[PDB]
Amino acid sequence: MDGSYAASYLPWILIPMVGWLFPAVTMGLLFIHIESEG
Amino acid sequence: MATKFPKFSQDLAQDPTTRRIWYGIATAHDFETHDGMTEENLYQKIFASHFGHIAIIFLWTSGTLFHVAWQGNFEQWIKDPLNIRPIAHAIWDPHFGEGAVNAFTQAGASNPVNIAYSGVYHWFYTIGMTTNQELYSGAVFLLVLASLFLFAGWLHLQPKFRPSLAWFKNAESRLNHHLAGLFGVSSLAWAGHLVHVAIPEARGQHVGWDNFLSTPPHPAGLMPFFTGNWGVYAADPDTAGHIFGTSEGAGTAILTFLGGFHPQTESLWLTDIAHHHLAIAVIFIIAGHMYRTNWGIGHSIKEILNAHKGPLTGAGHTNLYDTINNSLHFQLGLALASLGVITSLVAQHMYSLPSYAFIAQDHTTQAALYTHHQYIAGFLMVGAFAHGAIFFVRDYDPVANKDNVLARMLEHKEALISHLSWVSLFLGFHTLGLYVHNDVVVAFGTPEKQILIEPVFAQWIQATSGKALYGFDVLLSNPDSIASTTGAAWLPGWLDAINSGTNSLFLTIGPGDFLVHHAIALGLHTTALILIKGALDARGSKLMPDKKDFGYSFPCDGPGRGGTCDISAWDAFYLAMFWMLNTLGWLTFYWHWKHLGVWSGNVAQFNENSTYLMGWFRDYLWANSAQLINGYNPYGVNNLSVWAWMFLFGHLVWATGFMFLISWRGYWQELIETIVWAHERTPLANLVRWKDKPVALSIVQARLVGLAHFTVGYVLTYAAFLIASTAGKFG
Amino acid sequence: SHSVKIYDTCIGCTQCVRACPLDVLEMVPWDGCKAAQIASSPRTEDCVGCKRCETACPTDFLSIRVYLGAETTRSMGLAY
Amino acid sequence: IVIFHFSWKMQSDVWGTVSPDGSVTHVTLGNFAQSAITINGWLRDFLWAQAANVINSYGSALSAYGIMFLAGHFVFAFSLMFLFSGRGYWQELIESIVWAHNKLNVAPAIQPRALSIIQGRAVGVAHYLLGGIVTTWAFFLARSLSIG
Amino acid sequence: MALSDTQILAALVVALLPAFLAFRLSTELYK
Amino acid sequence: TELSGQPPKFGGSTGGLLSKANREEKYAITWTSASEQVFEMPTGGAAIMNEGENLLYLARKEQCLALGTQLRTKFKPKIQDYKIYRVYPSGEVQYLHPADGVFPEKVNEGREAQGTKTRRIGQNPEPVTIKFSGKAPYEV
Amino acid sequence: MAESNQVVQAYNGDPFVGHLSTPISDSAFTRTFIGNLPAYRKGLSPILRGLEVGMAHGYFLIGPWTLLGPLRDSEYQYIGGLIGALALILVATAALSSYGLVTFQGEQGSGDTLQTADGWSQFAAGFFVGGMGGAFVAYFLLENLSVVDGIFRGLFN
Numbered sequence A: 001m002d003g004s005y006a007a008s009y010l011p012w013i014l015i016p017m018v019g020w021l022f023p024a025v026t027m028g029l030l031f032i033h034i035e036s037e038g
Numbered sequence B: 001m002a003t004k005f006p007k008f009s010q011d012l013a014q015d016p017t018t019r020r021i022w023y024g025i026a027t028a029h030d031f032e033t034h035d036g037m038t039e040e041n042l043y044q045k046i047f048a049s050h051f052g053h054i055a056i057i058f059l060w061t062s063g064t065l066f067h068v069a070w071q072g073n074f075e076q077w078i079k080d081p082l083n084i085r086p087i088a089h090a091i092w093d094p095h096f097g098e099g100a101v102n103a104f105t106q107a108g109a110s111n112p113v114n115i116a117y118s119g120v121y122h123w124f125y126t127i128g129m130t131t132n133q134e135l136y137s138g139a140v141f142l143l144v145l146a147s148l149f150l151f152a153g154w155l156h157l158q159p160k161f162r163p164s165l166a167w168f169k170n171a172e173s174r175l176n177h178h179l180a181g182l183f184g185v186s187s188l189a190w191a192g193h194l195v196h197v198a199i200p201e202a203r204g205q206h207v208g209w210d211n212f213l214s215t216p217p218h219p220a221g222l223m224p225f226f227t228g229n230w231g232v233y234a235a236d237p238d239t240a241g242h243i244f245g246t247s248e249g250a251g252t253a254i255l256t257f258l259g260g261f262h263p264q265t266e267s268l269w270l271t272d273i274a275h276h277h278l279a280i281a282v283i284f285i286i287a288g289h290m291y292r293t294n295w296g297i298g299h300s301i302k303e304i305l306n307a308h309k310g311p312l313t314g315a316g317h318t319n320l321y322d323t324i325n326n327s328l329h330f331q332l333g334l335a336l337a338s339l340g341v342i343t344s345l346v347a348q349h350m351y352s353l354p355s356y357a358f359i360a361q362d363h364t365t366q367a368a369l370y371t372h373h374q375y376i377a378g379f380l381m382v383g384a385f386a387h388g389a390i391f392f393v394r395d396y397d398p399v400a401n402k403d404n405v406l407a408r409m410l411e412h413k414e415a416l417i418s419h420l421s422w423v424s425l426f427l428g429f430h431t432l433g434l435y436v437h438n439d440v441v442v443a444f445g446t447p448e449k450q451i452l453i454e455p456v457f458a459q460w461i462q463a464t465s466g467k468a469l470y471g472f473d474v475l476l477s478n479p480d481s482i483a484s485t486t487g488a489a490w491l492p493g494w495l496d497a498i499n500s501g502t503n504s505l506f507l508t509i510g511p512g513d514f515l516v517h518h519a520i521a522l523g524l525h526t527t528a529l530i531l532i533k534g535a536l537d538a539r540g541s542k543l544m545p546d547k548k549d550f551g552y553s554f555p556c557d558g559p560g561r562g563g564t565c566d567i568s569a570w571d572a573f574y575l576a577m578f579w580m581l582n583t584l585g586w587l588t589f590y591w592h593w594k595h596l597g598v599w600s601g602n603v604a605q606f607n608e609n610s611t612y613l614m615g616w617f618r619d620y621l622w623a624n625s626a627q628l629i630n631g632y633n634p635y636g637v638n639n640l641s642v643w644a645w646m647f648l649f650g651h652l653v654w655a656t657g658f659m660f661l662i663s664w665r666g667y668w669q670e671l672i673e674t675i676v677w678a679h680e681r682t683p684l685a686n687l688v689r690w691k692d693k694p695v696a697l698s699i700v701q702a703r704l705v706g707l708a709h710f711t712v713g714y715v716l717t718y719a720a721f722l723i724a725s726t727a728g729k730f731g
Numbered sequence C: 001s002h003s004v005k006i007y008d009t010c011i012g013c014t015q016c017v018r019a020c021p022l023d024v025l026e027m028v029p030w031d032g033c034k035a036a037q038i039a040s041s042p043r044t045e046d047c048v049g050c051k052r053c054e055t056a057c058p059t060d061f062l063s064i065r066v067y068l069g070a071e072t073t074r075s076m077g078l079a080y
Numbered sequence D: 001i002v003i004f005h006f007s008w009k010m011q012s013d014v015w016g017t018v019s020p021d022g023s024v025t026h027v028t029l030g031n032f033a034q035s036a037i038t039i040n041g042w043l044r045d046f047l048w049a050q051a052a053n054v055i056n057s058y059g060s061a062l063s064a065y066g067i068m069f070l071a072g073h074f075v076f077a078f079s080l081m082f083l084f085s086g087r088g089y090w091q092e093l094i095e096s097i098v099w100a101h102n103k104l105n106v107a108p109a110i111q112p113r114a115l116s117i118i119q120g121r122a123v124g125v126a127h128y129l130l131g132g133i134v135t136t137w138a139f140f141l142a143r144s145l146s147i148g
Numbered sequence E: 001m002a003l004s005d006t007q008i009l010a011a012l013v014v015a016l017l018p019a020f021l022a023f024r025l026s027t028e029l030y031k
Numbered sequence F: 001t002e003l004s005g006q007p008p009k010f011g012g013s014t015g016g017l018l019s020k021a022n023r024e025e026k027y028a029i030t031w032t033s034a035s036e037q038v039f040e041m042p043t044g045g046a047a048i049m050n051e052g053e054n055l056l057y058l059a060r061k062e063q064c065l066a067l068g069t070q071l072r073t074k075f076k077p078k079i080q081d082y083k084i085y086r087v088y089p090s091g092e093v094q095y096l097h098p099a100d101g102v103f104p105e106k107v108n109e110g111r112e113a114q115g116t117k118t119r120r121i122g123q124n125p126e127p128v129t130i131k132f133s134g135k136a137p138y139e140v
Numbered sequence G: 001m002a003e004s005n006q007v008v009q010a011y012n013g014d015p016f017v018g019h020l021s022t023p024i025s026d027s028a029f030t031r032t033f034i035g036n037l038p039a040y041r042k043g044l045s046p047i048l049r050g051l052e053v054g055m056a057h058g059y060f061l062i063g064p065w066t067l068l069g070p071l072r073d074s075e076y077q078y079i080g081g082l083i084g085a086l087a088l089i090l091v092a093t094a095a096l097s098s099y100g101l102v103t104f105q106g107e108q109g110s111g112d113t114l115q116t117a118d119g120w121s122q123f124a125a126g127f128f129v130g131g132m133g134g135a136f137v138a139y140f141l142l143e144n145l146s147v148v149d150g151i152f153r154g155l156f157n
Ligand code: CLA
Pocket: A010, A011, A012, A014, A015, A018, B056, B059, B060, B061, B062, B063, B064, B066, B067, B089, B090, B091, B092, B139, E011, E012, E015
């Protein structure tokens, strides 16, 4: 994996963020919201 | 007690099972059933939702533009469009190995990349965009456009700017502003863009934001438009030797009408396109002055509809203004039917009469475009009929529409359904019989007894447009005909493009095209029969004379009265989806096989083997798969690895849909009960307990999920086959 | 829960009560048919929705109708 | 899956010819080891490859196998209609057709009823099994009769 | 040319604006 | 009050009560038997009812009602004196079946009429006439 | 009275409390964001809150000395940053614990568990462990940056 296009360091950390951090956060928030009050 | 989600349905919020989750996702957009919904709040929420959707479309377009600019080879693609393949964007996947990296460093890229297949490169080029910075500024501006529409949607939900119900129900003014302003002014602005930018850039004249005020697109200004001598603008059109992007063969014309195809790019002339847009702009602005608003002068839709009474019909179209204006499912069904028809129309007109430069040579992109838009049209048609049935279930008023066209359509629904049944049985019986006869005839080593029947009517129609291959000499195929000697500037180019067997305009048809058009007729007739029978019985039948009391979508009515599985109109939609997918499969199979033959010059294969179905089984499906299924093998990986993997992915998803479709709930609820027993009695896991009681998917949910997997698999596997075959063969 | 309605086309043959597996229905006195009785749905919170009462109904189209509503532990038939 | 395994393994690592050297040349050249480990291998080097005998069987004594191949495919697709739908839609369609026959007084005394739910299931599974098994019957017979 | 390094990480700040406005529109439509 | 009766002779099974009986609710069937008999368990397998009073706890009401139908339809001296109650985790007991000491199959005085529509089936109001309300044709 | 377009209202409906409800001080986003930080997230015991806060803080406290401390231009740049971060987290733990020792001598309240002697000591313990671990794990990432890069680029496939 590499990239002659500019700012090739951006996908480096942006692919894990879109694939791991963002989904985990959204799924956790939606899970807490689904199971709220009781 | 209450579990909060979903806030819009206490009947769901008090569900202590996992269904509460699923249904919460399934009924969120059905605003009409939200607790305490009012019509005015319904309309206002729909308005804001529309704003959000427009912002989403603008963001997706900005993504296309930005990724093409950033990770594409647009400027390199312009240097040699016929050889350089356009790239959509770069790949960045840590799962990749050396083989995959080497395979996907393609089209002269220094890194793994996917090649574009949507013809957006040809679009942007024919439009006049020539650098990366232009695409970039376009993406940023579209970001701003999405921002504007998002703020508008936020503002229209505030008590200080909430449009009222009477404003939403103003049909006359809305039709005026859409016909005249939304449609007409926009085609006017697109004509102006083509005149100022697209055509000058096609001739090598750079027109940007830094010079468009200084350089007029015509040697004469607006006085020839002001005075009336409009032929000045036809001047010297682009010669038949104009090379695109240069000044060779270039002229000064900004509005022509020579018809035919550009000899190099093989697309419509940009001058004729801008001329078309100008004429259509004038027509739409004229249309947008029909209905009165606040100046007394004009028409009212209600009086026009009321006036159209009659003898045999009865009430005619009386009160239909209120009928359509008070039901949003009626408006949505009308819109969906119209938009699906015209989306199929776009699909039929883009492969035959292309309008983007050099896109006729890019065969994969054209195949993918035709397939995509025909699938969109099929979805839109199914949705239109679903919303018609939903209108019948929720909004239909029998007293305000008594004896009118609607009530009569319902009053003889048995005749309509039975005659659709007859035409469908007719078509299917005889087309399948002819195909099986041809198969059995070719099989026994006697291919001479095939029933080949010439598509005479459609060949005659082609000839009426100037097609002289079949020797019909009728209308525009006959030079001695009145219609052919009128002095229309579009006749020479049209005849030259329709009588040169080198493009995709009015393709020569044999008996196989006849058979497959009858198959298409069967598909349409049967899908429409499903949808119409569902919409007309949606209010009731002889099994459920009160089916309207249960709603548009319900599981059933039980095993009693003989059994009532798939009774609701929603079940008719779900049934019709299968036949719609089959109809689009027949469409795309026909299109792709005939076009592969056309592109390879070996039309003999399709013309001689499309008559028996084994021809389709071995010469189309089996053959064109050979490349795809070798995208990866025991020997390595080529550029079709993703397409082969996605082919198998679609197969898997399709079969998984079969899973939900064949096996029905109760078995699964019992199985889940045993698994619940297991969990409650296994130590350590007893530390943990579910918040929602696990339950099997519901009946309607199971139909929806099986159909969702079926459709996902259908689309993905056929897209993989289309792309891989047409790209490994290069047409 | 589910709604179980009874209409005036009731003939009072008591078959739907006999067919009910969760004791949702009762036979109350009436004066609209020969049997001088009509069906009722007092214990609807125990209705699961198996449509047996409709299956055992003789009138030309049922006089007793079951409409599936908000699901709960009792309506979903859960033993857990 | 059992019979597909049997066919491919026999043709790959067992069945074949033997030249006067002790050396054995198998039918499909031992491709089981490197190809039967992925699903793409079963799709390409087993189904796509070995169905070439069945599809090109027209014009020979095995054209009947291609005919029955297509016939089993058709019967599977036909079963799908009984497997994916419900009785109520068909009973409503039959009601409309019964009205149409009432229009011309061709109404049969034996009232047409849609297949019962259980019967719909039985018909669907019967046609499914028939179509699939006949498909693989034609495929296996043509293949194993066109390998010498 | 090729897009500037500084240019790619300039569109993201502009994208922060439709992100904020979509967040606002979602939260308002939830009401 | 306090439910009385001897538990049926049963060796145990995996189909009986779960966590719901103690977290949510449970049900009870009592019945008198003319002799030690063998009956089928709604949760699977055979059990032996004692002569005299029998008390049995079940997870769902339909299970108790299935046992009642079996008692009243499958034995030579028909057992029809069975009673079905609902027990809550607080120990509260709610008598259920038969509601008024008489089976609901046969008419009995004192019973009100609920869910009874004065109109016909085909006389329900059209949905469009009640739209944007929280009601359905069978509710107004 | 069709005039409440104002976004800055009285804080918590009390105009005489020294605060103003503003899009930063009391908006839905800031409220749901700060309120769900480990310091305020409901359903969290003090030691878990301290663990999370320490993880974050010790992780980011590696950088300053790593890139700017005196060992930045030595062969022990990452080790020097790590040592500085560990000493800083130790001093901060001492400060946290001293604060807890002095503020909770009297009667233990019943509001929230964090605002007690036991709760604050648990928070300090969690902070110490989380901070030492976060500093060591950011150090370990920096020292093994090549394997991280090879992983995120698929170089080892
Ligand atoms: C819907 C539009 C769209 C789509 C489908 C994609 C697609 C993709 N992008 Mg891109 N991107 C877009 C717009 C889009 N982009 C815009 C407008 C910008 C400039 C602000 C960028 C800048 C960007 C960068 C810097 C990178 C990508 C990258 C990627 C790839 C991985 C996603 C990622 O990691 O970045 C996440 C994307 C962003 C942080 C930008 C936000 C996207 C827009 C502004 C919002 C889209 C909202 C839209 C409604 C979708 C919502 C979901 C939907 C269900 C409602 C992926 C194929 C990576 C890549 O190059 O792959 C190799 C990467 O390095 N994008």
